[PDB]
């Protein structure tokens, strides 16, 4: 006998590989296993594990937010393990070089028509095998609608959690527990 928790074995879990059996994403993973293995680029280590990620851990990035993050750094390549979506609320976009897994059709046209480039991750490893002169960006992870419902319960003090309710209006989740005139105010 030896005093250990679960025999000293790891009880946490991480994705050691992607879930999708998508042949091209499988090919990209083989490239970056080789790149992390031989080049030891810390950038390359980040790109590999982000490739092993679910759709909700790789949220999209709008071109408005990307244009803000690139401003003044147009001698570098924006890198997003995810999707670039077009944003109508922007007018000025600089000529910029963006690598991403996907571009929407409107986004890619907007970037190209500015005089930029819509790179893939295979093309990135040609032009930056160690991620040199790159701007590595994520999108807003906690911006989902589901995230509003997370955290402390809707009916506890100081919580601003969104309740699961089937409709809106006065008859749905407003009376007892939501105002002083009906019982109590949460």
């Amino acid at each position: 006998g030896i005093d250990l928790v679960a025999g000293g074995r790891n009880k946490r879990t991480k994705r050691t590989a992607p879930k999708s059996d998508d042949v091209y994403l499988k090919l990209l993973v083989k490239l970056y296993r080789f790149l992390v293995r031989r080049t030891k680029s810390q950038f390359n280590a980040v790109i590999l594990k982000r490739l092993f990620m679910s759709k909700t851990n790789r949220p999209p990035l709008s071109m408005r937010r990307l244009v803000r993050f690139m401003e003044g750094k147009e001698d570098k390549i924006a890198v997003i393990v995810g999707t670039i979506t077009d944003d109508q609320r922007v007018y000025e976009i600089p000529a910029m070089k963006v690598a991403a897994l996907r571009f929407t059709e409107t986004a890619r046209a907007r970037i190209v028509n500015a005089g930029g480039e819509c790179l893939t991750f295979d093309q990135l490893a040609l032009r930056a095998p160690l991620g040199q002169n790159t701007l590595l960006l994520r999108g807003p992870k906690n911006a989902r609608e589901a995230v509003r419902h997370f955290g402390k319960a809707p009916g506890v003090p100081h919580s601003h959690t969104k309740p699961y309710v089937r409709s809106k209006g006065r008859k749905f989740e407003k009376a007892r527990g939501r105002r002083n005139s009906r019982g109590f105010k949460v």
Partner: protein, 234 residues
């Protein structure tokens, strides 16, 4: 083909580079063995002097009409003697901190008011005492394993020590012994480096494990008599 010659040439460069590294290493190995030889002589030298000096000091006091109080012990060897079932939570936690989480595991300790008061709270579970040169040396050679990158690596050679400690100017097993025995400036590092010793069940048996050594059992402090118990579990 260009890809053919392009590939061979780099391998020639790479193969050329390796021999320079290996040529450099035999030279460093030659320097090291003399350095290691030099260190071991004085370590062997000064232990003999320390033994003779205590004999000398005690003799001088007796002819003066007084007597020499010997230096208080600094190194303990602690061995676990009780199994892992039915343990009190505070006793359980201390033995984890002492790196004793299996019966007949042994580690080396510094004496401290902080340390001695941790052994007082887990004493029924451990036997301990003051190790000597032979016990400290034979434990480390025979049963010494290193903690390299969280892994238990046997100290079959000196390079394991160099890569293990190195920074603290610990280069050989013999200076690793010295660092442990004469508790030195890097005793913390050189004692955490050693993985907990895995000892035999004692050849010849124990007395009643349930009692203190003073009563005739085996628990507690048995100061120099720990060396007799090392011989039988090593």
């Amino acid at each position: 083909p260009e890809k053919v010659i392009l590939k061979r040439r780099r391998e020639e460069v790479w193969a050329a580079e390796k021999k320079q590294k290996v040529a450099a290493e035999k030279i460093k190995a030659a320097e090291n063995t003399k350095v290691i030889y030099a260190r071991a002589e004085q370590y062997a030298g000064e232990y003999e002097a320390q033994d003779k000096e205590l004999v000398q000091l005690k003799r001088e006091a007796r002819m003066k009409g007084g007597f020499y109080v010997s230096p208080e012990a600094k190194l303990l060897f602690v061995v676990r003697i009780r199994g892992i079932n039915a343990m009190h939570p505070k006793t359980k936690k201390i033995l984890q901190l002492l790196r004793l989480r299996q019966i007949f595991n042994g580690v080396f300790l510094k004496v401290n008011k902080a340390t001695i008061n941790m052994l007082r709270r887990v004493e029924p579970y451990v036997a301990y005492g003051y190790p000597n040169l032979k016990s400290v040396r034979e434990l480390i050679y025979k049963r010494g394993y290193g903690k390299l990158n969280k892994q238990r690596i046997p100290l079959a050679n000196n390079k394991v020590i160099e890569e293990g400690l190195g920074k603290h100017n610990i280069i050989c097993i013999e200076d690793l012994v010295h660092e442990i025995l004469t508790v030195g400036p890097h005793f913390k590092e050189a004692n955490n480096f050693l993985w907990p010793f895995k000892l035999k069940a004692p050849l010849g048996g124990l007395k009643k494990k349930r009692n203190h050594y003073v009563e005739g059992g085996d628990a507690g402090n048995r100061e120099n008599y720990i060396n007799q118990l090392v011989r039988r579990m090593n």
